[PDB]
Design an enzyme around this catalytic site. Structure first.
Site, short mmCIF file in Angstrom:
data_model
loop_
_atom_site.label_atom_id
_atom_site.label_comp_id
_atom_site.label_asym_id
_atom_site.label_seq_id
_atom_site.Cartn_x
_atom_site.Cartn_y
_atom_site.Cartn_z
N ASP A 45 -86.33 33.76 7.18
CA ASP A 45 -87.16 32.81 7.91
C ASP A 45 -87.95 33.50 9.01
OD1 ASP A 45 -88.27 30.66 9.13
OD2 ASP A 45 -86.41 29.86 9.97
N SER A 93 -106.55 32.43 11.52
CA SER A 93 -107.35 32.48 10.31
C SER A 93 -108.81 32.23 10.67
CB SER A 93 -106.84 31.45 9.31
OG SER A 93 -107.69 31.34 8.18
#
Length: 330
Positions: free
Chosen positions: A35, A199
């Site tokens: 994770d 992004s």
């Protein structure tokens, strides 16, 4: 040193991925959920409340000759999905795919929430976010990666998750045969303890690319792709019959619909998520309504590039003095 381990979807939908981890001496092998969105290595154990164990493999520290109680230490974690666990802490030898860390904090669960009990396939979590998020008290503990880092050939790990198939976590090296083209690296902020990056935009199917900054985290422990409601609406508008269902808790669509791809920007490079990766199957057995793999992050407080996005790429988690993230197509 290096390590290399195969990671395997827990079910036919890729709801999560499990990776075998050897703990203690003699080794006890547990299947952990790696994770990159959290920083605790915790396991079902001989100390876990009996009624809360249902099929999981447990770690028994009393059977490990290398286990040592971390005296006075406790831990307690709550995840974004509302699940939680807590307990005490041992140090022990932990190996992943041939890479061994001695003295790793192994957080033994005394209590786990129902979603963990109900998932027989996940024996615990292995956190790979920054150690500043680790919940052990009074002395915060380091992640497996943080402990291994100085010994690794290069201070990196990579995630290569498969679509409806196994993939690979590598530690200490970049497998240049595992991706096409080049790896585009992008800046990381560690201020929230996550692999947080920005992004450069998105496209829906064959549509034109929209240049827009989307801050979010690279999180292997989250199944879906959670993005701003504007982006998500633009995606599902291109799917006939799709709708946001408050009763279901997100966008659903008829399985007879064709899903467009979704492209996200990494610098000037582009990662294309095929439409099929965005199908999470019937909301309930026999239903014609399918759950979507791109959902709104509104009210999460952060955008999450979870498995839906990451499995479309070869992803480098670069733990150099100034950490960065790398993405390649594959």
């Amino acid at each position: 040193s290096t390590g290399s381990a195969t990671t395997t979807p827990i079910d036919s939908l890729d709801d999560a991925y499990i990776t075998p981890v050897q703990i203690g001496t003699p080794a006890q092998t547990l299947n952990l959920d790696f994770d990159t969105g959290s920083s605790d290595l915790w396991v079902f154990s001989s100390e876990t409340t009996a009624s809360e164990v249902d099929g999981q493999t447990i770690y028994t520290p009393s059977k490990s000759t290398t286990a040592k109680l971390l005296s006075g230490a406790t831990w307690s974690i709550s995840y974004g999905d509302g699940s939680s666990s807590s307990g005490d802490v041992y140090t022990d030898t932990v190996s992943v795919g041939g890479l061994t860390v001695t003295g790793q904090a192994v957080e033994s669960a005394k209590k786990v929430s129902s979603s963990f009990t109900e998932d027989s396939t996940i024996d615990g979590l292995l956190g790979l976010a920054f150690s500043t998020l680790n919940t052990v008290s009074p002395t915060q503990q380091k992640t497996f990666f943080d402990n291994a880092k100085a010994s690794l050939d290069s201070p990196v790990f990579t995630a290569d998750l498969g679509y409806h198939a196994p993939g690979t976590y590598n530690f200490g090296f970049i497998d240049t045969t595992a991706y096409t083209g080049s790896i585009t690296y992008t800046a990381v902020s560690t201020k929230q303890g996550f692999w947080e990056w920005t992004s450069t935009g998105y496209a829906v199917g064959s549509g034109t690319f929209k240049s827009t900054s989307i801050d979010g985290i690279a999180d292997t422990g989250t199944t879906l792709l959670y993005l701003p409601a504007t982006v998500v609406s633009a995606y599902w508008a291109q799917v006939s019959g799709a709708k946001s269902s408050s009763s279901v808790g997100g966008y659903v669509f008829p399985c007879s619909a064709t899903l467009p791809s979704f492209t996200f920007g990494v610098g000037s490079a582009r990662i294309v998520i095929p439409g099929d990766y965005i199908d999470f199957g019937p909301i309930s057995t026999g239903s014609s309504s399918c759950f979507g793999g791109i959902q709104s992050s509104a009210g999460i407080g952060i955008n999450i590039f979870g498995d839906v996005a990451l499995k479309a790429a070869f992803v480098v988690f670069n733990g150099a003095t100034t950490p960065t993230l790398g993405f390649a197509s594959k």
